[PDB]
DNA sequence: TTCAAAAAGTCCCA
DNA sequence: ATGGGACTTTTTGA
């Protein structure tokens, strides 16, 4: 339930908002971290904040009370008007108390430590700086009374698939004071994501971004499956609103390769532009100039999108898949009729241009009629996992029966020609079905409209959507997951803008000549790069680029 | 009635 | 023991 900050990224954290402060203009900054812990941050700011007050010292004695404003007497007055933390976990704010103590008995020094839930509390006051790692909560994992509270106090931020760190982001925003500074590490989702959408507009719109430091798939925390960012805002009145974008080149780099996390962001490791925050759109498209061009070429030459010609849909959620789906070569399968099977894929079955055979089978237990006829079936197979089928929502509230898949979906969608790609992936990997192949949620599928059949085939469509420029093209906004993963997701797939000119016909001709070898007994892999870098020319040359 | 989003992923191995 | 690679379920709000 307690994460470890790496150091580095606290000390470049604390240093962001405090190496400009002016102590002698305001000697009573507050310092605010709302998940405080163990003191990660607070500590770091305590070390910070006493050398700021003694360097300055005899500046302070001479402007103000000259009794007061003594070397003795920092480490009182940083405890009392300075750190102040917050933490839902007792054990530790007591830790965090001692290590404050432990710093340099008397009148006992006040310790402005709350221990509380950040997100209830009633704060009596705004704040000059704010930092921490905030909790990361997502929608399965958070207990379902809790989210009735943040779906009502936190919906400008909080809804459907959101996440607990949203709220956070809010709160911090919420008191700041005007003129102060905010810097958090929080995953990186946010920043491309669907449930992101309302978040980023709350961000935009009440504070200027400073700085954006994006780690894409790079492991921050060890042995923790999650991608980081580092935000920096400020509440100040300034005309500029140009956002500092720091982006990750290489995701494989050790953390610590300096002293300092400044040192690695100058270096050839990351990659620095700007944005400005005034063109920012409901998404935050944050890439160089290159990558704009090459974006905007794209999108203003392309007349129909994914969505506008296509169907799409997500593959069966059977909700227990030990229930439903068995080998190919199962001896169990002789008891069930073959009217009953489905051929099933993984999102690892999806190459480019085609589809592995399939290697398992679905049992579409939604066209058993009753427990009666088809006893076997549901004795020797489905009901070996009986009681947790019946735990699934739609058994408990009566909606489907223990032995039915849970999203059955309509078979009719399935078994037609489609184009199917995997839900994670390192690169686009859109393939034609020829097989009326049935999949989990790992894969998506999509048919063409009729209406558009006669501009857009299937052949054509894996064609230019397999290409190294579509590639590029769809990472520029993709949701980056982990390392050497993107989410392939239709709210960003359709969203793909697409082409009709005069290399139409050669480059669905190159298609199919691809496909034609990848569908033989001794393939030419060879031979298909060539014809791939064929049509990634006429596609190049098709888009300007 | 029934869609589609969600990595403090999950699991294994050298 | 850890860090890195292959691979991806079903719960859930709307
Ligand atoms: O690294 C994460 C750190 O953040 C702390 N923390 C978690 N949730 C917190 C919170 N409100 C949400 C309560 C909450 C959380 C989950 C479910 C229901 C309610 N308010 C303050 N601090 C919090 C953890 O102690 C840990 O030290
Ligand atoms: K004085
Ligand atoms: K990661």
Same mark, same amino acid.
């Given at each position: 339930?307690?994460?470890?900050?790496?150091?580095?990224?606290?000390?470049?954290?604390?240093?962001?908002?405090?190496?400009?402060?002016?102590?002698?203009? %305001?000697?009573?900054?507050? /310092?605010?971290?709302?998940? @405080?812990?163990?003191?990660?941050?607070?500590?770091?700011?305590?070390?910070?904040?006493?050398?700021?007050?003694?360097?300055?010292?005899?500046?302070?004695?001479?402007?103000?009370?000259?009794?007061?404003?003594?070397?003795?007497?920092?480490?009182?007055?940083?405890?009392? #008007?300075?750190?102040?933390?917050?933490? +839902?976990?007792?054990?530790?704010?007591?830790? $965090?108390? !001692?290590?404050?103590?432990?710093?340099? !008995?008397?009148?006992?020094?006040?310790?402005?430590?709350?221990? @509380?839930?950040?997100?209830?509390?009633?704060?009596?006051?705004?704040?000059?700086?704010?930092?921490?790692?905030?909790?990361?909560?997502?929608?399965?994992?958070?207990?379902?009374?809790?989210?009735?509270?943040?779906? *009502?106090?936190?919906?400008?931020?909080?809804?459907?698939?959101?996440?607990?760190?949203? @709220?956070?982001?809010?709160?911090?925003?919420?008191?700041?004071?005007?003129?102060?500074?905010?810097?958090?590490?929080?995953?990186?989702?946010? &920043?491309?994501?669907?449930?992101?959408?309302?978040?980023?507009?709350?961000?935009?719109?009440?504070?200027?971004?400073?700085?954006?430091?994006?780690?894409?798939?790079?492991?921050?925390?060890?042995?923790?499956?999650?991608?980081?960012?580092?935000?920096?805002?400020?509440?100040?009145?300034?005309?500029?609103?140009? /956002?500092?974008?720091?982006?990750?080149?290489?995701?494989?780099?050790?953390?610590?390769?300096?002293?300092?996390?400044?040192?690695?962001?100058?270096?050839?490791?990351?990659?620095?532009?700007?944005?400005?925050?005034? &063109?920012?759109?409901?998404?935050?498209?944050?890439?160089?100039?290159?990558?704009?061009?090459?974006?905007?070429?794209?999108?203003?030459?392309?007349?129909?999108?994914?969505?506008?010609?296509? +169907?799409?849909?997500?593959? +069966?959620?059977?909700? @227990?898949?030990?229930?439903?789906?068995?080998?190919?070569?199962?001896?169990?399968?002789?008891?069930?009729?073959?009217?009953?099977?489905?051929?099933?894929?993984?999102?690892? %079955?999806?190459?480019?241009? /085609?589809?592995?055979?399939?290697?398992?089978?679905? /049992?579409?237990?939604?066209?058993?009629?009753?427990?009666?006829?088809?006893?076997?079936?549901?004795?020797?197979?489905?009901?070996?996992?009986?009681?947790?089928?019946?735990?699934?929502?739609?058994?408990?509230?009566?909606?489907?029966?223990?032995?039915? $898949?849970?999203?059955?979906?309509?078979?009719?969608?399935?078994?037609?020609?489609?184009? =199917?790609?995997?839900?994670?992936?390192?690169?686009?990997?859109?393939?034609?079905?020829?097989?009326?192949?049935?999949?989990?949620?790992?894969?998506?599928?999509?048919?063409?409209?009729?209406?558009?059949?006669?501009?857009?085939?299937? *052949?054509?469509?894996?064609?230019? $959507?397999?290409?190294?420029? #579509? !590639?590029?093209?769809?990472?520029?906004?993709?949701?980056? =997951?982990?390392?050497?993963?993107?989410? #392939?997701?239709?709210?960003?797939?359709?969203?793909?803008?697409?082409?009709?000119?005069?290399?139409? *016909?050669?480059?669905?001709?190159?298609?199919?000549?691809?496909?034609?070898?990848?569908?033989?007994?001794?393939?030419?892999?060879?031979?298909?790069?060539?014809?791939?870098?064929?049509? !990634?020319?006429? +596609?190049?040359?098709?888009?300007?680029?």
């Amino acid at each position: 339930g307690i994460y470890y900050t790496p150091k580095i990224i606290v000390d470049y954290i604390v240093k962001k908002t405090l190496k400009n402060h002016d102590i002698i203009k %305001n000697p009573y900054p507050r /310092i605010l971290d709302i998940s @405080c812990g163990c003191g990660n941050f607070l500590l770091e700011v305590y070390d910070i904040l006493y050398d700021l007050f003694e360097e300055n010292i005899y500046e302070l004695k001479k402007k103000y009370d000259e009794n007061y404003w003594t070397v003795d007497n920092i480490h009182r007055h940083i405890l009392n #008007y300075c750190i102040y933390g917050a933490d +839902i976990d007792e054990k530790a704010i007591s830790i $965090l108390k !001692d290590s404050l103590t432990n710093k340099k !008995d008397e009148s006992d020094i006040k310790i402005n430590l709350f221990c @509380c839930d950040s997100l209830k509390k009633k704060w009596r006051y705004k704040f000059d700086y704010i930092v921490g790692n905030p909790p990361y909560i997502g929608h399965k994992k958070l207990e379902k009374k809790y989210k009735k509270f943040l779906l *009502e106090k936190y919906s400008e931020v909080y809804k459907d698939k959101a996440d607990l760190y949203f @709220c956070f982001y809010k709160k911090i925003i919420d008191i700041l004071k005007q003129g102060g500074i905010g810097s958090v590490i929080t995953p990186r989702y946010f &920043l491309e994501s669907l449930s992101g959408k309302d978040l980023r507009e709350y961000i935009k719109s009440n504070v200027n971004v400073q700085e954006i430091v994006d780690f894409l798939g790079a492991n921050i925390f060890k042995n923790i499956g999650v991608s980081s960012c580092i935000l920096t805002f400020d509440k100040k009145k300034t005309k500029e609103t140009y /956002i500092d974008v720091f982006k990750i080149k290489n995701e494989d780099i050790c953390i610590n390769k300096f002293e300092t996390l400044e040192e690695l962001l100058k270096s050839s490791k990351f990659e620095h532009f700007n944005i400005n925050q005034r &063109l920012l759109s409901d998404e935050w498209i944050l890439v160089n100039k290159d990558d704009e061009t090459f974006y905007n070429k794209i999108q203003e030459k392309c007349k129909y999108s994914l969505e506008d010609i296509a +169907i799409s849909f997500q593959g +069966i959620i059977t909700g @227990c898949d030990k229930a439903f789906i068995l080998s190919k070569d199962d001896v169990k399968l002789n008891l069930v009729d073959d009217k009953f099977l489905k051929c099933w894929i993984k999102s690892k %079955n999806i190459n480019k241009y /085609i589809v592995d055979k399939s290697e398992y089978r679905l /049992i579409y237990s939604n066209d058993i009629d009753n427990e009666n006829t088809n006893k076997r079936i549901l004795d020797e197979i489905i009901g070996l996992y009986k009681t947790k089928l019946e735990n699934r929502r739609e058994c408990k509230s009566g909606i489907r029966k223990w032995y039915e $898949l849970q999203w059955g979906r309509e078979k009719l969608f399935f078994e037609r020609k489609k184009i =199917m790609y995997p839900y994670k992936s390192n690169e686009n990997r859109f393939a034609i079905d020829y097989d009326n192949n049935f999949s989990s949620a790992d894969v998506y599928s999509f048919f063409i409209k009729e209406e558009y059949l006669d501009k857009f085939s299937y *052949e054509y469509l894996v064609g230019i $959507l397999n290409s190294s420029v #579509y !590639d590029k093209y769809f990472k520029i906004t993709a949701k980056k =997951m982990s390392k050497n993963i993107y989410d #392939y997701y239709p709210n960003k797939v359709m969203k793909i803008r697409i082409f009709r000119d005069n290399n139409y *016909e050669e480059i669905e001709n190159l298609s199919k000549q691809i496909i034609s070898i990848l569908l033989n007994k001794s393939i030419d892999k060879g031979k298909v790069e060539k014809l791939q870098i064929k049509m !990634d020319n006429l +596609i190049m040359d098709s888009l300007g680029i």
